[PDB]
């Protein structure tokens, strides 16, 4: 009951689509960061503002574990100062992001033959997301003067597009699970110290 429940986030059997990204608030526990990195089975483990190792002696008030699934090429978009569909309209890290981005290929978990249409991403949006904003709207996108009134058609599109993950895709198009750890500041989540 002391250790931070990082297995709940990382080892979970199903992840949210990037548009409806998941946030687990983490407070009052100790964070290993040895088990997390040193079991380096992750395709990406980048830490902005903090050394990845020599991190488990520092205390914070709470830490947020955001989790989702994107395609392989889109992992590089999960970083401060990036632009693109995922950064603009699904998940935007702040320009001064202090925390770690961890990502691993999940083709064996999230690709069905014939395509997995569960995982979606927001294709149409008028403005870019504010950092750490979550948009879960399904209202029809109005690309023209004529109002859509919730029907598809010309200038009227459904805002979310499915990844359709097939296991025969290029690795940049295979599913990739992503956990973004943000550290935020009486500090109570600490490392082993």
């Amino acid at each position, epitope marked *: 009951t002391n250790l931070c429940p990082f297995g709940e986030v990382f080892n979970a059997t199903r992840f949210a689509s990037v548009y409806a990204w998941n946030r687990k608030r983490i407070s009052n526990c100790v964070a290993d960061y040895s088990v997390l990195y040193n079991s380096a089975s992750f395709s990406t483990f980048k830490c902005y503002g903090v050394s990845p190792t020599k991190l488990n002696d520092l205390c914070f008030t709470n830490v947020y574990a955001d989790s989702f699934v994107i395609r392989g*090429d889109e992992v590089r978009q999960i970083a401060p100062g990036q632009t*693109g*569909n995922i950064a603009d309209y699904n998940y935007k890290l702040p320009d001064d992001f202090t925390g770690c981005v961890i990502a691993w290929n999940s083709n064996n978990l999230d690709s069905k033959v014939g395509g997995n249409y569960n995982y979606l991403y927001r294709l149409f949006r*008028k403005s870019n997301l504010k950092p750490f904003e979550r948009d879960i709207s399904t209202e029809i996108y109005q690309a*023209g*003067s004529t109002p859509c009134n919730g029907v598809k058609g010309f200038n009227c599109y459904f805002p979310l597009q499915s990844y*359709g993950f*097939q296991p*025969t895709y290029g690795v940049g*198009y295979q599913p990739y699970r992503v956990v973004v750890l943000s550290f935020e500041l009486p500090a109570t989540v600490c490392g082993p110290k």
Partner: antibody
Amino acid sequence: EVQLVESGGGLVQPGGSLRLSCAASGFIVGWNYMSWVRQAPGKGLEWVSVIYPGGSTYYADSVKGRFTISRHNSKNTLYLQMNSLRAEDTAVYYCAREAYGMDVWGQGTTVTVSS
Amino acid sequence: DDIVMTQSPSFLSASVGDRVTITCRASQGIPSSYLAWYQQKPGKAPKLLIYAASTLQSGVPSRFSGSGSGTEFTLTISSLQPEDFATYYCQQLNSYPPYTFGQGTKLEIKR
């Protein structure tokens, strides 16, 4: 309506500048993925640039640092500014909207670069 | 690194009423929603025929059918007609640029 009428193409020397205008009717330029695609004499289609509804802009590798895509919200108009025009840029230029595949194109305008 | 679209054939000969298959191949396995099919007469702008690799663009005749997945996609004109003699391009929309076209296929009259 529902057209894209272009203008601004012409004759320039290498290192010259043009500014292609693309006026839309039928949709809203700022609310769509608006793209520039060129086609050389006797060649195929090459994507040149794109502006997202949110603002982000992406350019073909052969035009980076010389072309800039923009839009006027009032006049509902897309723009392609072409500086340091190389002779390879000689082509018919089209502006298009991308909804799911590029469904609305323009009549095009000709850019010719020669000394 | 990037995705290369390759079309087959580059020139194609057929008659009115003939059945025509144009093939587009990708350098990588890509989502089928990515690619569209366009038609172009001489001296004229491309017209979007197919998108999401099978969905028929509004107003385009029924003889045009798109199919395929993975790395192989096909435009098929079921019963060739005089107005279908043109050049045809495939295109992948990558949702992160660049957008890439096929080399094209000129559909000419067989004699």
